[PDB]
Amino acid sequence: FGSGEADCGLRPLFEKKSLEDKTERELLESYI
């Protein structure tokens, strides 16, 4: 493979800095 399979799916400027983006909520608010 490569490297980072462990770290993937986490944005350095969001998930990792405890931040959610403009429309992000809208998605999560749809799995209900």
Binding site: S3, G4, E5, D7, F14, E15, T23, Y31
Partner: protein, 248 residues
């Protein structure tokens, strides 16, 4: 992307644009699944009808870019490809079935706040997330309407029930492709378009809060037409193959 909106900085690390060596010019989207593997759409590289048969060194990729044309010094990174890998049973003849293809960077990229891979799904995440009504997130620098944008466009779209997809078009749909889009009765709209192909259709997880690339901007009749939807290759449905090229 039709009816989208300007993406934020670092909102889609994995977003990778795929150019052509020379005469050098954009021609698809792609994701970044590891520091050295880029996942793109089959016919972005190989489509006999348009007589497009690209290869390892006919093209390159520009990673972690947010605008589109301005050169973002210290932010973006160019990289060539060491090898292309089109699916073996990519039925481009009837219905762009199995429209997947990954490419191995020649030299491992360097992660930063702008570069980062988007997790591939797994049976659980797939089962858990690939459901009608659930929304995903398409992203790209493709045409804005059925001209081109200035910065990575982004749009969120609900997934559609198998039937409805199959009924929106005359083409033979496959279990290796799903469709995302708003119905005409949901009022709101949007959809991927031309040049968005190869792009990633991602979904955040309510559990481990990670981003999973569920599909890939493949085809669609027109752009953002009412009663018609975009079609994305089913990334997970093709993981087995995806896996069995990286492991070797």
């Amino acid at each position: 992307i039709v009816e989208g909106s300007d993406a934020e900085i670092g909102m889609s690390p994995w977003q990778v644009m795929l150019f052509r060596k020379s005469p050098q010019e954009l021609l698809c989207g792609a994701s970044l699944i590891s520091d050295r593997w880029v996942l793109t759409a089959a016919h972005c590289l190989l489509y006999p009808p348009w007589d497009k048969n690209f290869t390892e060194n006919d093209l390159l990729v520009r990673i972690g870019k947010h605008s589109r044309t301005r050169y973002e010094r210290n932010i973006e990174k160019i990289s060539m490809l060491e090898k292309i890998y089109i699916h073996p049973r990519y039925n481009w003849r009837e219905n762009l079935d199995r429209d997947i293809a990954l490419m191995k960077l020649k030299k491992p990229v360097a992660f930063s706040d702008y570069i980062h891979p988007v997790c591939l799904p797994d049976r659980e995440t797939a089962a858990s997330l690939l459901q009608a009504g659930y929304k995903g997130r398409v992203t790209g620098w493709g045409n804005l309407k059925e001209g081109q944008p200035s910065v990575l466009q982004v749009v969120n779209l609900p997934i559609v029930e198998r039937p409805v997809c199959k009924d929106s078009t005359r083409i033979r749909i496959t279990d290796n492709m799903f469709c995302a889009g708003y119905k005409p009765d949901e009022g709101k709209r949007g959809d991927a378009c031309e040049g968005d192909s190869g792009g990633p259709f991602v979904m955040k997880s309510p559990f481990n809060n990670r981003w999973y690339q569920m599909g890939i901007v493949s085809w669609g009749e027109g752009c953002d037409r009412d009663g018609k939807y975009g079609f994305y290759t089913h990334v997970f449905r093709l993981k087995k193959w995806i896996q069995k090229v990286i492991d070797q």
